[PDB]
Structure formats: C-alpha cells, structure tokens
Subunit: 134 residues, 6 copies
C-alpha cells in the first residue's frame, strides 16, 4: 500500500525505521512549505515517523498534525510511547518507542512483531475505523 | 486477521493459548487504565483469553465486557465452559474449557479442531452475525 | 465454510456421514436445551444429518426445524428420501437416503457425487435462493 | 457452477452431451411430478438438454418451459437448431443441433468450441442479460 | 471474455484477424436475418471485424451499427483507419487498418501491440466508459 | 492498467521514459486535432510525459490540460519539477524532473523507485482521490 503527505511549513521531517526488532532511523528528510510526498512500504522500511506541520492521507482517511496490513497512530500529547512484541516463543515487549504531541507514526505488521502496545494519549486509525485514547 | 482491545481499568489480562489440542496459557499480560492493544493470530497462538474491564473490537463489531476464519464468545454468567473436537477419525470432545461472567474468548479454526461446544450462558459473534444463548 | 446450530430441547442429535459413495454414520451427538454448535466441513465429513428440535443457521439464512459449495434440505413431511449420483462414466443413482418430517440435511459437493435427487416434500436452500417442493 | 430443475409432470427428461466435438446423449433421465434436480458441469458433461414440463433456475434467473462461463437457450418454436465452431486453425461449423418448441439447452465453453450459432426462434440468457430472437 | 451479435439482415459478415503484427482475415462468415452469434477471444483470434446490419452487445453496453482487457470502435463515417504499435524497443506504427461508415472493430491487447491509433470519426467504448471522436 | 488521451490540436506529443533510474525519452509522438490514443504501461515504459492541448482520461477521472499502482500529476504552473527515490539501502533523490505549465505526467511504481517528490504548483490524482498543491 501507499500513503500521502503534505507540508504546511519548512522542515517537515521523515524518519525511516529499519525493519525488524533492531530499530533506528536511517533518514531525516526536510520538506519545505507546500511539499507533497508519496512513498511505499518496503522490505527495508516497515514503518515511518513523521514530524513537523504536515497533512497525512491514507486509506483510513485524512489526518492533520495540528487538529486536536498497517495501522496509524497520532500523538495527542507529549510523552507518548509505543512498545513492540517479539514474534515466536520468546515473548516480551522488546522496545519502548517515544513520541511527542502532534507526532505521527505508521507501520506495517512484520514477521518480527505480532502485537504493539501504546502509551500516552493518542489517536488510532485502522482498516476497521478509528480509536481515541480518551 | 486482527483484533483491538481497550482497557477500562488496571490489571486487564491477556492469556495466549498454545495452538493445538494441548492447551495452556503461556502469557499473562497486565494492562493499565487507558491501554490499547493490537495483535495477530499466529501459528503459536490460535486463541486468546481476555480478562478484566476492557473493550474488545473486531470485524464482527464492538463488544463490551460489562454490558449485559474465527469466532467470538462472551460469557454472560459464571461457570461458562467450552469444548473442542479432535480432527480426524478419532472423534471426541477433548477438553472442557471454563470461563466466568464477563470473560471473553476468541479463537481461529485449527487443523487440530473442526468444531466446538459451549456451556453456560454467553453471547456469540461470527462473520454471519450474532447469537445469544438465551 | 461453516454452519451454526442451536438446541431447543435435550437430545438434539448430529450424525456425520462418511465422505464418499460408502455412506454411514460415525457419530451420534446429544445436545441439551440451550446448546450451540459450530463445525466445519472436513475431508472426513462432507455432509451432516441433524435431528431433534433445533435452530440451524447458515450463509443461505436461518432455518427452524418446527416451522412448516453446498446445499440445504429440510424435510417437510415423513418418508423424505434423497439419492446421489456416482461421478465418472459409470452413471447411476447409488443410494436412496431417507429422512423424516422436520429432519434437516446438509452436504458439500464431492468428487464422488456430481448430482443429487430428492423424494418427499421438503424445502431447499442454496447460494442462489430457496426452493419448496410444493 | 450449478443449476436447478423442477418437474411439473411425470417424464421430464435429461440428456447429457459428451464433452467435445463428438456429441451424443449418454443418459435419459425420467422425473416424476414434483421432482427437483441439482447437478454440476463436469469434464464428462459440458452441456445438458432438458425435456418436458419443468422449471429451470440458474444464476441468470428463473426460466419456465411453458411460458411464451456458460450460456442458456430456450426454444420458442419447433425446428430450433444450434451449431458449434471447432477451435483451432481448422475452422467450420461442425454440427447442427436441433431442438423443439419449449426445449431448453445449457452448455459451458469448451476447448473444442469457441463459438456457437443458433437457428429457429429462441430465448437466450447469459451473465450479461437476456436476448430474444424476435 | 465474450461478446454477442445479432443480425438485422442477410449477409452480416465476420472477419477474424490473425493474432500478431501480421494481420489478415482468415474467415468470412455470412449471417441471415435474425442470426445470433456468440464467440470468445482466442490465441488464434485477438480481434474481430464485423460488417453489415447487426446489433453488437458487450460488457461495455449495447451498440447498434445504424444509429448515428479489450476495447471497442464504431466507425461513424467512411475512411476510418486504425494503427498499431509494435511492442519492444523497436517502436513504430506498423499498420494502418481501414474501416467504413457503420463498421465495428473489437480487439484485445496482445504481446505484439501495446498501443493503438485511430483515424476517421468513430465511437469508442472501454471498461471505463465511452468516447466520441467529435 | 491503461489510459486514454484525446488531442485538441495538432502536435500533441508523447514522450516515453525508460524504466529505471536512468531516465530519457525514447519517442516523440505527434498527434493531429481529433486524435485518440490508447496504450499500456510496459516493462520498457513505466512513465509517460504528455505535451500539447489534449484530454487525458484514467481510472482516477478525466483531466484537461487547459483548465486551471500508478499516480497522476498535472503542472499548474511553469518550473514544476519532480524527484525520485532510489530503492534499497543507498538512499537519495536521484533526479530532478522538470515540467511546464499545463504539462502532465503519469508513472507506475517501479523496483527502482519507492517514493517521489514534486516541486512547483501542480494537481495530483491517485486511487484515493485528488490533491492540489495550493
């Protein structure tokens, strides 16, 4: 599948997360005002972290960064965190991702992870609908 | 497929059942108030047992723990039990699962089981609709 | 595919027919009042015979035993019979199944049978709709 | 796919045509009043000829013998004929089938035939709709 | 896929074009008044040229010869021509087909051709809709 | 998939871009007034550049050159540019395409490119809807 982004300012950033349990950012894009980005989910990148004033658009609908298979998360407040399961018999929440207010995250479901856990107040969108932490 | 859970309290628990006739719980999660969980059905886990005050959401609709392919069961009362068939020529109800009032169960259909039998008063949801024991 | 049953009394029975031309019953279930059953069609069982006061539910709709791919039959009266073709060049109606008033039958289409013939007054449901013998 | 027939009298007949250019009838069924028949299209039988007072029902709708992929033909009058093409470079109308008023024909599309031609007044039904010779 | 034709006169003709860049007519059918034809698109025939007073019917709708994947063309006037691309690196319009007023053409997309060009005034129908040269 | 073009003048041009990171134009078509073109996306051509007064029609709708999976771009003004990502670990915007006011571009998603970036004011259409740079 694919997604669409639009920039409301200069400096809107994109971080690509390495696919797998070992997670780190390999890119730091910079988008000027009026930018529009189109991209896929690849074997190298199963998730994307968006930053800055931007508009994100996907199959589940259109999301705004400022307004108060795969899945969507929008951080309503600061300190928002996320956790990931390790597939297989060895079971534990491997990582504790972190996000700030207004940050957005998107990720597919990988052979390395079968479940996810979230912390902080945030909005969630899926192929089934939407879900708010409050 | 996938499912979504939301926690209304602290201590909402998740038990993963080992896939196959040999059934036992390999995990005991703990969810605080405001938790949200997303997970898949895996070769290691064909069924899930949910416990505590929570909201469960699936393709068949949205279910509440307190309000009075794969399938869904919601225990309306205490003493609710479930049974499973053994696939193949050797035919008999192998186990007698047990559930309490307000407990929820979800399970795929496995190569080890072709049919299921339920006891106690409960609610059932499927790709076809819903069914109440009363 | 799958089907759902509900019991209105004690003693609702289920007979599984051996897949193939050689047909006989390998099981005789007993369902108490309030029972609910879920099962698949398997290589070992291509058809099922239901007996007793029960409610049957499938993709073609919901059927009642008392009210006056695969296919559905409901015996409106006693003496209802069914016949099966033998696939291949050797062509003849191999068997003459029998059913009583209120009895229900369900069966897939197998490599052993390509056509079926019915006798007695009965109701039929398919992926296309419903059909009454009268 | 499949089809359904219902008999309005005794002696409703079914002829199965051998699949391929070499066409002849291998069966002559007899249906009493109130009969109902269900059958498939098989490698041995790509077409079926129906005779007598009967009701035929398919994905394209419900047809009556008396009222004035695969395809459907209903003979409105006597002398109705049909012709078949031979697939491959060798091209010619191999046969000239014949039908009487009220007769019905059904046939799949085979590796031996790519096109068909009809004569007499008749009604035609397809996955696209219906067509009358008049 | 398939198509349907109906004849409004005697002498309605059908020309089958050889599949590939080398195009010539291998057949010249003759249809009397009231004829109805059904045929497929085959490896031997990727396109068909229709001539005479007839009614053509396809998934894109119903067309009349007199009224003023694959694709459809209807010649509104005389001198209508069509051209075909040669697939691969070697690129040029290989042929210049010709059609008269009221003539109709149908063709699949082949490994030999990836694009087509038309000349004269004509009507076009596709899986997307219709298009008129005027 | 496919697309349709119509010419409003003489000299409407088509440029085919070589599939892959190495991009250059292999063809320069000329379309007279009233032209209509149909073509596919091929292994040799993953994108097409349209020039001149023309009407373009695709699954996402109908576009006009003058009015003020794969994707669509319409240059609203002069100086419009586009950029492409290089798939794999080696990550950078390889090229900076350029377009003038009224120019249109169409391209599939290739194994060589996973994302694209645009510059200038333009209109975008996708399987999800439309997007304007303003």
């Amino acid at each position: 599948n694919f997604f669409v982004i639009k920039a409301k300012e200069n400096g809107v950033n994109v971080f690509g997360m390495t696919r797998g349990t070992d997670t780190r950012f390999h890119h730091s894009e910079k988008l000027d005002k009026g930018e529009v980005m189109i991209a896929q989910f690849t074997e190298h990148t199963s998730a994307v972290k968006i930053r800055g004033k931007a508009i994100i658009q996907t199959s589940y609908g259109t999301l705004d960064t400022e307004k108060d298979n795969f899945f969507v998360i929008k951080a309503k407040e600061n300190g928002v965190n996320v956790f990931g399961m390790t597939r297989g018999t060895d079971t534990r929440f491997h990582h504790s991702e972190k996000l700030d207010k207004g940050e957005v995250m998107i990720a597919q479901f990988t052979e390395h992870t079968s479940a996810v856990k979230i912390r902080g107040k945030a909005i969630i969108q899926t192929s089934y609908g939407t879900l708010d932490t409050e």
